[PDB]
Amino acid sequence: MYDWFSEMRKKDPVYYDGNIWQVFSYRYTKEVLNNFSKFSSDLTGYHERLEDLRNGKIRFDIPTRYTMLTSDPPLHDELRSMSADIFSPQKLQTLETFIRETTRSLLDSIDPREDDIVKKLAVPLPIIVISKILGLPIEDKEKFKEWSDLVAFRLGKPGEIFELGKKYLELIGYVKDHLNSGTEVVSRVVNSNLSDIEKLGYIILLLIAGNETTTNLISNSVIDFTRFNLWQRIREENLYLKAIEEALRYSPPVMRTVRKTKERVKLGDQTIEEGEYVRVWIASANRDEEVFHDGEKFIPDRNPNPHLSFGSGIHLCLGAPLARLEARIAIEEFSKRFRHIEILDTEKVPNEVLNGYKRLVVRLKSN
Ligand code: HEM
Ligand SMILES: c1ccc(-c2cnc[nH]2)cc1
Numbered sequence: 001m002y003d004w005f006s007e008m009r010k011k012d013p014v015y016y017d018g019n020i021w022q023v024f025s026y027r028y029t030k031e032v033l034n035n036f037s038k039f040s041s042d043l044t045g046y047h048e049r050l051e052d053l054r055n056g057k058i059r060f061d062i063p064t065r066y067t068m069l070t071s072d073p074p075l076h077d078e079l080r081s082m083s084a085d086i087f088s089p090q091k092l093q094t095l096e097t098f099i100r101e102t103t104r105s106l107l108d109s110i111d112p113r114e115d116d117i118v119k120k121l122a123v124p125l126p127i128i129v130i131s132k133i134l135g136l137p138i139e140d141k142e143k144f145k146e147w148s149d150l151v152a153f154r155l156g157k158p159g160e161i162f163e164l165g166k167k168y169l170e171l172i173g174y175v176k177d178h179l180n181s182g183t184e185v186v187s188r189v190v191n192s193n194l195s196d197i198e199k200l201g202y203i204i205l206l207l208i209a210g211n212e213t214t215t216n217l218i219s220n221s222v223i224d225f226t227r228f229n230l231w232q233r234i235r236e237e238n239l240y241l242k243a244i245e246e247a248l249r250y251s252p253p254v255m256r257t258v259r260k261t262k263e264r265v266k267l268g269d270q271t272i273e274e275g276e277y278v279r280v281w282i283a284s285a286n287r288d289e290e291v292f293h294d295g296e297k298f299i300p301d302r303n304p305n306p307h308l309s310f311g312s313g314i315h316l317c318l319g320a321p322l323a324r325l326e327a328r329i330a331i332e333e334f335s336k337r338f339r340h341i342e343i344l345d346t347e348k349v350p351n352e353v354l355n356g357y358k359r360l361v362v363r364l365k366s367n
């Protein structure tokens, strides 16, 4: 993928293939993401059917079609403002203890002889933490993951119709049946002027949408640090914070996102007409030579590091601070308890939008 990205950044930064437009450079990728007035996120019919949702004419529908992720202003802020401080520095600080204790416990279940860290650590951590933060109970652990997988899948394909399967129905039932136990943020959404469908969509987004991406950040970090033999230096120079950002830039959990033009727009040397879909390749922008010197090289102490892995503009990842914290703690604690790491087997998640691992089997030394 990266040799292709490179060639495109050089010859066709903004390329039209007759179906959609694709952007590969940092400059333009950032331009699209920030210019919400001309590059819309309204790709799931949220704005068009908002009215029939609010007045109740629409009763059965896909909740995830209606979240802030696929809304433009002013609806966007009306939604985001309700949870904009859900991961406040003060709240996160209080959670560090929970996250650390949790991480320590997950690490204790690992059999050093041979075990899958995606299963034992990368997958569990985010679920346990978001569950704690939102107040929604972890019961059937396999179902939680199933929901994590399906939601991430759908979010990567905005506008593509998919009927509510059994699993999704169980997800919806679960949320409906546990809203009462929800915390502050959840109560604010439940007691708002949003239609039921929206409340369900909003809760699903907060509770499940960030699990697979954070899991991938953790998995990708382990892989990179190991591939490039950086563990020793990271511990020694305390590059955790910087090295995790390099991991976000070098191996982004989300490879790209989507936008639609609302009007004729000039992007680079190209002119894009109205109603066109624009695939923004975050993964490619993150390696742009202009912005990141020696961009194809992993530099653990790279700084500053303005990667676009959390996006940019009004939709900048609401969960960025939490994802960063969980990743930092998982990596920090992992490096301390384990002396050496040997990767025995790996299996990648077959997906174009999400970049991570389904299995990461390793052999470790303690102390
Ligand atoms: C390392 C993991 C993560 C990555 C790389 C990631 C990436 C992103 C990106 C690129 C966007 C913007 C997409 C666009 O502009 O179309 C975004 C939006 C968002 N993310 Fe994440 N995310 C991560 C973790 C999380 C977590 C932990 C949560 C929540 C528990 C979360 C919640 C959200 C929400 C709600 C939005 C919508 C923001 C808005 O539309 O205003 N993310 N994320
Ligand atoms: C596809 C695209 C984005 C996401 C996401 C962003 N933040 C949390 N999940 C998940 C799947």
Ligand SMILES: [Zn+2]
Residues within 6 Å of the ligand: 137, 139, 178
């Ligand atoms: Zn229950």
